[PDB]
Amino acid sequence: IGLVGKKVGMTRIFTEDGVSIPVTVIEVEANRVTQVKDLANDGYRAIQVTTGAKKANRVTKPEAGHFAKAGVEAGRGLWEFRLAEGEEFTVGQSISVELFADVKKVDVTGTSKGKGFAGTVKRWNFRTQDATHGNSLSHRVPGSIGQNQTPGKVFKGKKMAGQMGNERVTVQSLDVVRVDAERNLLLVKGAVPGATGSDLIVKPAVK
Amino acid sequence: AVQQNKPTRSKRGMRRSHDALTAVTSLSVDKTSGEKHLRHHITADGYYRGRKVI
Amino acid sequence: MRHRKSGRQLNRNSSHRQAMFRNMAGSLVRHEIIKTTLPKAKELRRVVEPLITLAKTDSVANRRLAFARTRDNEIVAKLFNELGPRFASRAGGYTRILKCGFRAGDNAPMAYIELVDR
Amino acid sequence: MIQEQTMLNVADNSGARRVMCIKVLGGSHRRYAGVGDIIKITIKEAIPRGKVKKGDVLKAVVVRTKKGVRRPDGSVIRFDGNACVLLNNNSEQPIGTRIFGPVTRELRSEKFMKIISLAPEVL
Amino acid sequence: SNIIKQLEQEQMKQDVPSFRPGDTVEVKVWVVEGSKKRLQAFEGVVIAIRNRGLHSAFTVRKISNGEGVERVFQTHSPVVDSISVKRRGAVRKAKLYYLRERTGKAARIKERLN
RNA sequence: AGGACCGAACCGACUAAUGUUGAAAAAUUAGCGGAUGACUUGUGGCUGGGGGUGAAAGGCCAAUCAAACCGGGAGAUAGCU
RNA sequence: AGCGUCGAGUCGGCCUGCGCGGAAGAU
RNA sequence: CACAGGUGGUCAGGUAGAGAAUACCAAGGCGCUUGAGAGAACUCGGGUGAAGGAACUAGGCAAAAUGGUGCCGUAACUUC
RNA sequence: AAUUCCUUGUCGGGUAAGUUCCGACCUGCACGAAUGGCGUAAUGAUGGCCAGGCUGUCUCCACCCGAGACUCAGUGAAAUU
RNA sequence: GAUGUCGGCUCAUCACAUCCUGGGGCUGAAGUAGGUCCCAAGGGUAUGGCUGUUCGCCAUUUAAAGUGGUACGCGAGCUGGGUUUAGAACGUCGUGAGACAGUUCGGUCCCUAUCUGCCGUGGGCGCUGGAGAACUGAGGGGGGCUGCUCCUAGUACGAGAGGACCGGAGUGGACGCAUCACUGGUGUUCGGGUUGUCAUGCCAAUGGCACUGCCCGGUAGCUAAAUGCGGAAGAGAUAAGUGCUGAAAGCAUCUAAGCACGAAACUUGCCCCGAGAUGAGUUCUCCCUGACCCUUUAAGGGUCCUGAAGGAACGUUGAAGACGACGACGUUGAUAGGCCGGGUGUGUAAGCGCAGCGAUGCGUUGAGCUAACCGGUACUAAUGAACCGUGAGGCUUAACC
Ligand SMILES: [K+]
Ligand SMILES: [K+]
Ligand SMILES: [K+]
Ligand SMILES: [K+]
Ligand SMILES: [K+]
Ligand SMILES: [K+]
Ligand SMILES: [K+]
Ligand SMILES: [K+]
Ligand SMILES: [K+]
Ligand SMILES: [K+]
Ligand SMILES: [K+]
Ligand SMILES: [K+]
Ligand SMILES: [K+]
Ligand SMILES: [K+]
Ligand SMILES: [K+]
Ligand SMILES: [K+]
Ligand SMILES: [K+]
Ligand SMILES: [K+]
Ligand SMILES: [K+]
Ligand SMILES: [K+]
Ligand SMILES: [K+]
Ligand SMILES: [Mg+2]
Ligand SMILES: [Mg+2]
Ligand SMILES: [Mg+2]
Ligand SMILES: [Mg+2]
Ligand SMILES: [Mg+2]
Ligand SMILES: [Mg+2]
Ligand SMILES: [Mg+2]
Ligand SMILES: [Mg+2]
Ligand SMILES: [Mg+2]
Ligand SMILES: [Mg+2]
Ligand SMILES: [Mg+2]
Ligand SMILES: [Mg+2]
Ligand SMILES: [Mg+2]
Ligand SMILES: [Mg+2]
Ligand SMILES: [Mg+2]
Ligand SMILES: [Mg+2]
Ligand SMILES: [Mg+2]
Ligand SMILES: [Mg+2]
Ligand SMILES: [Mg+2]
Ligand SMILES: [Mg+2]
Ligand SMILES: [Mg+2]
Ligand SMILES: [Mg+2]
Ligand SMILES: [Mg+2]
Ligand SMILES: [Mg+2]
Ligand SMILES: [Mg+2]
Ligand SMILES: [Mg+2]
Ligand SMILES: [Mg+2]
Ligand SMILES: [Mg+2]
Ligand SMILES: [Mg+2]
Ligand SMILES: [Mg+2]
Ligand SMILES: [Mg+2]
Ligand SMILES: [Mg+2]
Ligand SMILES: [Mg+2]
Ligand SMILES: [Mg+2]
Ligand SMILES: [Mg+2]
Ligand SMILES: [Mg+2]
Ligand SMILES: [Mg+2]
Ligand SMILES: [Mg+2]
Ligand SMILES: [Mg+2]
Ligand SMILES: [Mg+2]
Ligand SMILES: [Mg+2]
Ligand SMILES: [Mg+2]
Ligand SMILES: [Mg+2]
Ligand SMILES: [Mg+2]
Ligand SMILES: [Mg+2]
Ligand SMILES: [Mg+2]
Ligand SMILES: [Mg+2]
Ligand SMILES: [Mg+2]
Ligand SMILES: [Mg+2]
Ligand SMILES: [Mg+2]
Ligand SMILES: [Mg+2]
Ligand SMILES: [Mg+2]
Ligand SMILES: [Mg+2]
Ligand SMILES: [Mg+2]
Ligand SMILES: [Mg+2]
Ligand SMILES: [Mg+2]
Ligand SMILES: [Mg+2]
Ligand SMILES: [Mg+2]
Ligand SMILES: [Mg+2]
Ligand SMILES: [Mg+2]
Ligand SMILES: [Mg+2]
Ligand SMILES: [Mg+2]
Ligand SMILES: [Mg+2]
Ligand SMILES: [Mg+2]
Ligand SMILES: [Mg+2]
Ligand SMILES: [Mg+2]
Ligand SMILES: [Mg+2]
Ligand SMILES: [Mg+2]
Ligand SMILES: [Mg+2]
Ligand SMILES: [Mg+2]
Ligand SMILES: [Mg+2]
Ligand SMILES: [Mg+2]
Ligand SMILES: [Mg+2]
């Protein structure tokens, strides 16, 4: 499994050898198991977790009953983690950042920052045409988008302008710099997806 | 760039399937005057949430 | 993108916006209620309410800083003599915005902006 | 951050005064040489009676850059000019007998220890 | 926010001495030859300060064997062992980048009498 | 003194971008040339179509030019569509 | 054929029916 | 066309300036007959840019640059 | 060579590298003496070539300020079929 | 009654007759390195000088600088150097007008996208009572490059010279994704310096205008040159190829039966989309338990009563965004603005005092001011409602109770 945390921000750890490690600080508060899924009922093995805290009134009756069945306080969302053969948890069990105490590498999944409607220069690293030398209205424009009568169409997956970012992104194999049960902190080396305050999924590195 | 064929009255109407105007969901009723008004807006007679403002 | 940016451009250059908000801030301190477009009214609070804050502490410095930001000694006088003392115990929120529908000529969303104790 | 056409000053007594980078060596489409990278150079200006002549094509190691060098704590060392030490084309050993101005500790390999040794300062 | 504050606070050197742009500082930095650790002095003019908590930095310019050298130190780095202010300079500006275009007599800074 | 020099008005039109169902059936913007002369400009006059006028480009002769425009021969003729 | 021995087939052409390889191309 | 064009003459303030250039003003005249929001791509017109500096390109096209007054000083060549 | 087809002639210069350029050679396909020959200071929005300065021309683009584009209200075209 | 033509630029896409990387047989293959043939299309596959060039030659790289198809791919995407209008000249031909599969200088590149296509993004209805969530994964897409160094080992091999396989570790190039902690760029919303001028009565102090007047710094954000991460290992089935056992054919034979191995290709493993997957799936939770009339009586049509869960709407908004959408928040409230404290940036405000003939200096004073930042704080605006959505959800058959 992994744990759901929040992106606090970035800072550094100065080591004794005079190395400055860039860290992302991840607030990993207690993940409370809301539902255990099994091969009999659900067809697969997983735990559903919640974390954080939700306003008493903005929890709907359908959502409130789901939390009420577990015997857990409502958190800000629900997330699943697939279980391996070895693992077992119970409904209501808390899992803390201490799960990662002996984990050396993590994959961190977030929602990337939203860039809105991006052109092909920004989105796909297309080269600009001439700034000068007679170029008419075609500086950052895409250029050609196909051939001729053969094939007489544009192929699917053609790189064009459109929505960029605001999507799920994993960054793999980030070194765990520090675990801190006391302050509910996981520090990982380097950048992770998403804005400050965004939800992050952290799992032990698959590679 | 221009059409090679005249589009139909059918296709015209299909495009205009999204042009329909939406009515105001409901009007709000002022506390004091009892004048109906646009919600979060001041009434025609200068009341808002039961207070003479203008 | 405009991530974390503040300020409306209002289809103006920066010199125009500054001049307009100076004129409009004056107008509001004089009359105490003005009707404007909802985004202009919303922006006017970010100019006006600092001027009233500055007017709470009547010094020669603050009067010149007020005059810099208004260019109207009549407006400066009302800030320091009337509004500053009027709003002394109040911690910001010297103005309120009340929406008042739509302008006939261009369907602009309009609003009143007034001083709260008017 | 040196590329093709970049003019470099010379930090040795080979006889060259100004050299032009004509190739950043060590990979396809490689854009830049920084401190410690070997470049191919042409000599544009030389002293009357050095070991090298104007128009000679040989190698050099970049020893100072304006872009500079980052250190593991996040610090930077920037120089006021770009400078290199001329190397023999085949051997890649320094042609000159002396080194002028400071070098960086990035040159500490097996390779450039003559330069390290001869330099007045290492940063 | 408050979390990063506390993470950062506990790494900040409490004994960073006071200095300003125009001051001649000597920065003693640790230098490693395998295991042999020694202090190398870097003395010159402070031309810029970035005050930014743990992420504080300062830029020291010196002319070094005929060549101008700027080093940007990270203030709370263990690399920087000590900072001694040697002279106090009297400048107006926060950033003295204009000294990059000056040499010798032009680049002299009047001493700050206090 | 000057078909002298630098440079506004004024007269031009070398380059580029824009514009190209234009703001404009030839322009705008930034630069560009001449600027006391073989200069430029107002008003009026004269030269008429195989004719004019031309520091000559077949240029120009009312947004028309290797033979103007209008009317007429005239429903030219069209082994072509 | 394997090899003195062991026990029934064994050898290479001819003609001919049908197959095999020779046989790499661009949405 | 209530059209960024074209159209001869006359008048000529202040400060700075060689000036009828240019900047800011006076007298006087006007804000150009759709507005309101938003602050994507892309296009247009601009500003700034690490390191490099013509490697761009048919071509340094475009841009960047130079830019004033006084004084010092100034080559080949020349019809002086 | 504003002339040379063969031709990027050959040799020299410049460049790391020069079908262009400059200087030569003469093998002038197919120069040549007022449909002028050769030279020439000065002049040129003239053609070619080189250098210094300079730079977003480029490596390789980034950000920002404005006008459109986008949304709302009013008015309301076009080629084509 | 028009299918724009060379070369470049931008963007490609396919073939394999493979340039590199991978696998392998033979060699006149000791090793290293070659030659030749077979398999293999996963990914990768120079910058410059000259020339309109494609090309070519040259310089210097690289693991390599592949060959072709795509209207000699791509001008409703750009260019316009070549070439083929009108000007002009040279050589040449011609008595000449003129002409040249000669040369030379100059010489307008239009289109607001209806349809298909493609990139993004919504609205509708469906999925069989309605609703809020979490999912499964049919299927689809992305990714797949490689140098050098060190160890193994100066070991095998070799007379020496030189010098490995196999295996392992490090560090790069190019490419991609994310991010802004650091280094920087930008920062016409912050601070300051300064020229000309106009004004605020004047001084002092300020503001306007002059490209943000010109500049110097710089916060947040955005961002690359900044710094984190990636390509995989592994698994399955194989290609060329190598075999085991093994007859047909007493022998032999990798093959006919049977069995093993074998590559960046293939199927997975990694990442992302994904139930309109109409084959519309699953799991968890929530909600609605009135009366009555009519008649061609049927999955029928009304009246009154009722109005849930939830949704929407409106408002304050966002590191979300063209608009829709998506997320936060609406007083039982930190959603935004303001305000308070801090930080950051600029660099010692004004006023007054003191020194000086004065410009100006010094003190008060690291002052004043300070955007988008951080921590807080109900002062202002997020309103009581109203609106949409209903009232236990077909038939058959089966199993069971
Ligand atoms: K005639
Ligand atoms: K000839
Ligand atoms: K003659
Ligand atoms: K000339
Ligand atoms: K191709
Ligand atoms: K082989
Ligand atoms: K391949
Ligand atoms: K064609
Ligand atoms: K073309
Ligand atoms: K076409
Ligand atoms: K076009
Ligand atoms: K069609
Ligand atoms: K940054
Ligand atoms: K920044
Ligand atoms: K002023
Ligand atoms: K479904
Ligand atoms: K969207
Ligand atoms: K607030
Ligand atoms: K002071
Ligand atoms: K003061
Ligand atoms: K301060
Ligand atoms: Mg965004
Ligand atoms: Mg490019
Ligand atoms: Mg054009
Ligand atoms: Mg353009
Ligand atoms: Mg087809
Ligand atoms: Mg519509
Ligand atoms: Mg904000
Ligand atoms: Mg507008
Ligand atoms: Mg201005
Ligand atoms: Mg003259
Ligand atoms: Mg003319
Ligand atoms: Mg002009
Ligand atoms: Mg002249
Ligand atoms: Mg002149
Ligand atoms: Mg002619
Ligand atoms: Mg005419
Ligand atoms: Mg005739
Ligand atoms: Mg007749
Ligand atoms: Mg007829
Ligand atoms: Mg056959
Ligand atoms: Mg008008
Ligand atoms: Mg007019
Ligand atoms: Mg005139
Ligand atoms: Mg005047
Ligand atoms: Mg003027
Ligand atoms: Mg814009
Ligand atoms: Mg600029
Ligand atoms: Mg630059
Ligand atoms: Mg700068
Ligand atoms: Mg620079
Ligand atoms: Mg330079
Ligand atoms: Mg040059
Ligand atoms: Mg070039
Ligand atoms: Mg080129
Ligand atoms: Mg130019
Ligand atoms: Mg310029
Ligand atoms: Mg020739
Ligand atoms: Mg050149
Ligand atoms: Mg030659
Ligand atoms: Mg050239
Ligand atoms: Mg010659
Ligand atoms: Mg002749
Ligand atoms: Mg004669
Ligand atoms: Mg003659
Ligand atoms: Mg046709
Ligand atoms: Mg093959
Ligand atoms: Mg492929
Ligand atoms: Mg394939
Ligand atoms: Mg594969
Ligand atoms: Mg080439
Ligand atoms: Mg073609
Ligand atoms: Mg092709
Ligand atoms: Mg075009
Ligand atoms: Mg086309
Ligand atoms: Mg041409
Ligand atoms: Mg002609
Ligand atoms: Mg930051
Ligand atoms: Mg900076
Ligand atoms: Mg700035
Ligand atoms: Mg006055
Ligand atoms: Mg004064
Ligand atoms: Mg004025
Ligand atoms: Mg004015
Ligand atoms: Mg100023
Ligand atoms: Mg594998
Ligand atoms: Mg056998
Ligand atoms: Mg590989
Ligand atoms: Mg504050
Ligand atoms: Mg400070
Ligand atoms: Mg000030
Ligand atoms: Mg002091
Ligand atoms: Mg806040
Ligand atoms: Mg309420």
Angle (CA) A102 A107 A112, round 5°: 145
- Give chain A positions within 8 Å (CB) of C4: none
Q: Would you tell me how many other CB atoms lie within 10 Å of the CB of residue A40?
A: 6
What's the burial of A179, exposed, middle or buried (CB within 10 Å: 0-12/13-18/19+)? middle
Interface contact flag, C112 B40, Cβ < 8 Å: no
Resolution (in Å) of the shown entry?
Answer: 1.9
Interface contact flag, B41 C100, Cβ < 8 Å: yes
> Which whole-number Å values give the CA distances from A176 to A29, A31, A107, B23, in the listed order?
17, 19, 10, 56
Q: Do chains D and A touch (3 or more CB pairs under 8 A)?
A: yes
Domain of residue B8 covers: 1-54
Q: Would you tell me how many other CB atoms lie within 10 Å of the CB of residue E38?
A: 10
Q: What is the residue type of A148? A: N
> Does residue B7 have a cis bond before it (omega within 30 degrees)?
no
- What are the tokens at D11? 């930090």
Query: For residue D75, what is the nearest residue in chain A, using CA coordinates?
Result: A20
Residue with tokens 């860290």: A23
Phi/psi for A113 (5° steps) reads -65, 140
Which among A14, A11, D116 is positioned nearest to E30, based on CA atoms?
A14
Protein CA at D43 to nucleotide C1' at I26, angstroms: 38
Q: Transcribe A36-71 into DSSP letters.
A: EE-TTTTSS-EEEEE-S---TTTS-HHHHHHHHHHT
The answer to whether D13 and D54 have CB atoms below 8 angstroms apart is no
The answer to whether A103 and A204 have CB atoms below 8 angstroms apart is yes
Residue with tokens 């084309």: D89
Residue C4 lies in a domain: no
Q: Would you tell me how many other CB atoms lie within 10 Å of the CB of residue C53?
A: 16
Which among A205, A204, A115 is positioned nearest to A165, based on CA atoms?
A115
> Which whole-number Å values give the CA distances from E71 to C87, E75, E88, E114, in the listed order?
52, 12, 19, 27
List of residues 6+ apart from E47 with CB closer than 8 A? E21, E59, E60, E61, E70, E95, E96, E97, E99, E100
C-alpha to C-alpha distance for A131 and A110, rounded to whole angstroms:
37
Phi/psi for A184 (5° steps) reads 65, 45
C-alpha to C-alpha distance for C73 and C71, rounded to whole angstroms:
7
The answer to whether E88 and D94 have CB atoms below 8 angstroms apart is no
What is the total count of domains within chain A?
1
Q: Would you tell me how many other CB atoms lie within 10 Å of the CB of residue D90?
A: 8
Interface contact flag, D74 E74, Cβ < 8 Å: yes
What is the total count of domains within chain B?
1
Structural method: cryo-EM
Residue with tokens 């200068």: B46
- What are the tokens at A68? 């009420």
**How many beta-carbon pairs under 8 angstroms link D with E?**
54
Name the 3-class secondary structure at A32.
strand
Q: Would you tell me how many other CB atoms lie within 10 Å of the CB of residue D50?
A: 19
The answer to whether A89 and A95 have CB atoms below 8 angstroms apart is yes
- Give chain C positions within 8 Å (CB) of A115: 1
C-alpha to C-alpha distance for C82 and B48, rounded to whole angstroms:
27
| Nearest ligand to residue C12 Cα | 29
C-alpha to C-alpha distance for C62 and A102, rounded to whole angstroms:
60
Name the 3-class secondary structure at B51.
strand
The answer to whether D17 and D9 have CB atoms below 8 angstroms apart is yes
Residue with tokens 């080591």: A15
Cα E106 off chain centre by: 21
List of residues 6+ apart from D3 with CB closer than 8 A? D21, D24, D31, D32, D33
Angle (CA) E22 E26 E28, round 5°: 145
A11 touches strand J (CB under 7 A): yes
- What are the tokens at A146? 């196909």
Q: C77-80: list long-range contacts, CB under 8 Å, 24+ apart.
A: C78/C29, C78/C30, C79/C29, C79/C51, C79/C52, C79/C54, C79/C55, C80/C55
Q: What is the residue type of D64? A: R
Domain of residue A163 covers: 1-207
Q: Report the run of H or E that residue A151 belongs to, with start and end.
A: none
Q: What is the residue type of A146? A: G
Q: What is the residue type of C40? A: K
Q: Can you name the residues that pair with E29 across neighbouring β-strands? A: E40, E80
Which residues line ion ligand 27, judged by CB < 5 Å? B 19
Could you tell me the distance, in angstroms and rounded to a whole number, from the CA of residue C75 to the centre of ligand 21?
A: 30
Q: Can you name the residues that pair with E44 across neighbouring β-strands? A: E25
The distance of A118 to chain C (nearest Cα, Å) reads 10
Q: Can you name the residues that pair with A148 across neighbouring β-strands? A: A151
Q: Would you tell me how many other CB atoms lie within 10 Å of the CB of residue C47?
A: 18
C-alpha to C-alpha distance for C37 and B2, rounded to whole angstroms:
41
**DSSP conformational letter for A102:** T
Residue C49 lies in a domain: yes
Q: Report the run of H or E that residue E72 belongs to, with start and end.
A: strand E67-74
**DSSP conformational letter for C11:** T
**DSSP conformational letter for A127:** P
Phi/psi for A80 (5° steps) reads -110, 150
Domain of residue C80 covers: 13-115
Q: Of D75, D100, D105, which is closest to E73 when you measure between CB atoms?
A: D75
Strands (DSSP E) contained in chain A are 3-14, 20-27, 31-37, 46-50, 79-82, 94-95, 105-111, 114-118, 162-165, 168-180, 185-189, 199-204
Name the 3-class secondary structure at D96.
coil
Which residues line ion ligand 24, judged by CB < 5 Å? A 136
* Among A19, A23, A127, A189, the residue to mutate for chain D (most D Cβ within 10 A): A19
Residue C111 lies in a domain: yes
C-alpha to C-alpha distance for E94 and E107, rounded to whole angstroms:
16
C-alpha to C-alpha distance for D19 and D81, rounded to whole angstroms:
13
Protein CA at C111 to nucleotide C1' at H28, angstroms: 39
Helix axes C38-55, C14-31, angle to 10 degrees: 70
Segments making up each domain of chain D, as ranges = 1-123
The answer to whether D80 and D68 have CB atoms below 8 angstroms apart is no
- Contacting chains of A (3 CB pairs or more, <8 Å) are C, D, E
The answer to whether D43 and D61 have CB atoms below 8 angstroms apart is no
Residues 73-132 of A with CB under 7 A from strand J: 77-80, 82, 107, 109-110, 112-117, 120, 124-127, 129-130
Residues in chain B: 54
Query: For residue B44, what is the nearest residue in chain C, using CA coordinates?
Result: C100
Nearest nt to the C10 alpha carbon by C1': H37
What is the total count of domains within chain C?
1
The answer to whether A14 and A27 have CB atoms below 8 angstroms apart is no
A134 touches strand F (CB under 7 A): yes
C-alpha to C-alpha distance for C75 and C80, rounded to whole angstroms:
9
* Sign (positive or negative) of CA dihedral A51, A55, A61, A64: positive
List of residues 6+ apart from C88 with CB closer than 8 A? C56
Segments making up each domain of chain E, as ranges = 1-114
Which among A28, A206, A25 is positioned nearest to A103, based on CA atoms?
A206
* SS3 of chain C: helix, strand, coil, percent, to 5: 50, 15, 30
Computed on alpha carbons and rounded to an integer, the radius of gyration of chain E in Å comes to: 15
The answer to whether C80 and C58 have CB atoms below 8 angstroms apart is yes
